Amino acid sequence: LPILLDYWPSMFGMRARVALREKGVEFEYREEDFSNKSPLLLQSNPIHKKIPVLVHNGKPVCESLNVVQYVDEAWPEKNPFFPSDPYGRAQARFWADFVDKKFTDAQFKVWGKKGEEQEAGKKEFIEAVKILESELGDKPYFGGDSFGYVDISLITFSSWFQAYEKFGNFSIESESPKLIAWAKRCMEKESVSKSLPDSEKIVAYAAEYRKNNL
Amino acid sequence: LPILLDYWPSMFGMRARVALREKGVEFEYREEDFSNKSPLLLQSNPIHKKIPVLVHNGKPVCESLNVVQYVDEAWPEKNPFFPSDPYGRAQARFWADFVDKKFTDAQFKVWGKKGEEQEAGKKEFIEAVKILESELGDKPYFGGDSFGYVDISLITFSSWFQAYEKFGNFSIESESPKLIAWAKRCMEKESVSKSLPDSEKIVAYAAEYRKNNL
Ligand SMILES: N[C@@H](CCC(=O)N[C@@H](CS)C(=O)NCC(=O)O)C(=O)O
Ligand SMILES: N[C@@H](CCC(=O)N[C@@H](CS)C(=O)NCC(=O)O)C(=O)O
């Protein structure tokens, strides 16, 4: 089977878990110890030494959105992640990029920082969530009538929402109610619920990080 | 025609110029004033307000690699930017991402910083250029036998090489001779030479930046 090198609380690795399950692709999950990275990880991703890595037919695919796109292309005959047209595909790439940049940067400040930087992060997080709310609009998914690439890129972060709300001491639903409705909607899918760890475990993880580093 | 909103010394906008010319696509170039951004730019890219933006059949495409991919998909019948197989496409995406991250970060430190940060940037730049040298190997292009996506992603920075060498006071050819041979090889293409400004103009631009900010 394809081998997925991963780390359980990673919102990035989770994207690969969701992608593979949404395709119905069977895979072997391997938990990496960053203090003791496997020979296969170091051989497969020598530049970044990061997860996720998908090893498929002897070839490594690195970077989580790259892996998601690879899964779409390697198993293209069912559950397409993208619309068929160039513009819709560019839209999907744009919004996943926005998640990888602005949203990712803001959320890390919320659970990973304290003081003024955390407060700044919380403001930036709320701005990002309002922008995403506006893009979703009244559609069931970012991909429209069907769950697709942008949904995969963002839904993994919903496992961290409890942690965001705890250390940011706020309610995401108050800021972006349709986004929260969307997260709940996606959680009805086995591809999502089986891929995302319990949010209480993520809280414990974030709590430990703050204890050790702040 | 498709409208390209751009800024002449931008290594990112240049990617769109190169992509369109490599496809033989006629376009209208518009020079944006960042102090006075056009209504079309603000309407087209309200989130980032950055160039390049390609406006095509009434629809805006934002982010330079996104634009390059869009050009490949919208004009797919000739000069393909990617190999046909999923793995080769994932490789191409990975390496363009490496250029957008590690290389882009390092080069900015070389021309945009002074002191220890510039010295760090110069070390990181040389590391990046050696990594890219290794990936290119003895192939004529990053895309292999033909100029492709990764070549487009990186070749625009060669217009900045003179500036890197000036403010970093060093020789890129000493560190990565095959990479320099590759840059010269690409400059033989009209799609590249017509898209890249004279490196002496870029030097003047960088010099002005350092005068005003360091
Ligand atoms: N841009 C990467 C980010 C992946 C990433 O940051 N992975 C983290 C875990 S969440 C990692 O592997 N860290 C390895 C380390 O700490 O050395 C992607 O989207 O795959
Ligand atoms: N990630 C973007 C970067 C583009 C970018 O940074 N563009 C700069 C010019 S090089 C810009 O538009 N700056 C606008 C501003 O300074 O407000 C891409 O690849 O398109």
- How many C-beta atoms lie closer than 10 Å to residue A204's C-beta? 13
- In chain A, the N- to C-terminal Cα span, in Å, equals 41
- How many C-beta atoms lie closer than 10 Å to residue A42's C-beta? 10
Check: CB of residue A107 under 8 Å from CB of residue A127: no
Helical ranges in chain B per DSSP H: 13-23, 39-44, 64-74, 86-98, 104-112, 115-136, 149-155, 161-167, 172-175, 177-187, 190-193, 199-213
Among A11, A51, A61, A98, residue to substitute to test ligand 1 (most atoms within 8 Å of Cβ): A51
Range A85-214 classified under CATH 3.40.50.720: no
**Residue A79 forms beta bridges with which residues?**
none
C-alpha angle with apex A110: A108 to A114, nearest 5 degrees? Answer: 110
> Hey, what are A75's tokens?
């198993």
The amino acid sitting at A17 is R
Q: Where are the domains of chain B?
A: 1-84, 85-214
**Residue A60 forms beta bridges with which residues?**
A55
Alpha-carbon span B4 to B41, nearest angstrom:
10
Check: CB of residue A150 under 8 Å from CB of residue A143: yes
CA distances from B166 to B160, B199, B204, B206 (A): 10, 11, 11, 10
Determination technique for this PDB entry? X-ray
Q: Which of B124, B118, B121, B142 is nearest to B132 (CA)?
A: B142
- In chain B, the N- to C-terminal Cα span, in Å, equals 41
Residues from chain A that touch B87, judged by Cβ atoms under 8 A, are 56-57, 59, 61, 70, 74
Backbone angles phi, psi at B27, to 5 degrees: -145, 160
> Hey, what are B55's tokens?
């406006």
**Residue A5 forms beta bridges with which residues?**
A30, A53
Handedness of CA A106, B112, B21, B187 (dihedral sign): negative
Q: Give resolution in angstroms.
A: 1.7
Alpha-carbon span A136 to A138, nearest angstrom:
6
Q: For A93, name the nearest residue in chain B, comparing CA atoms only.
A: B66
Handedness of CA B18, B21, B26, B29 (dihedral sign): positive
Alpha-carbon span B56 to A87, nearest angstrom:
9
Closest ligand relative to A98 C-alpha: 2
* One fold for B1-84 and B85-214: no
Q: In what order do the strands lie in the sheet with B59-62?
A: B28-31, B3-6, B53-56, B59-62
> Which CATH architecture group holds B1-84?
3-Layer(aba) Sandwich (3.40)
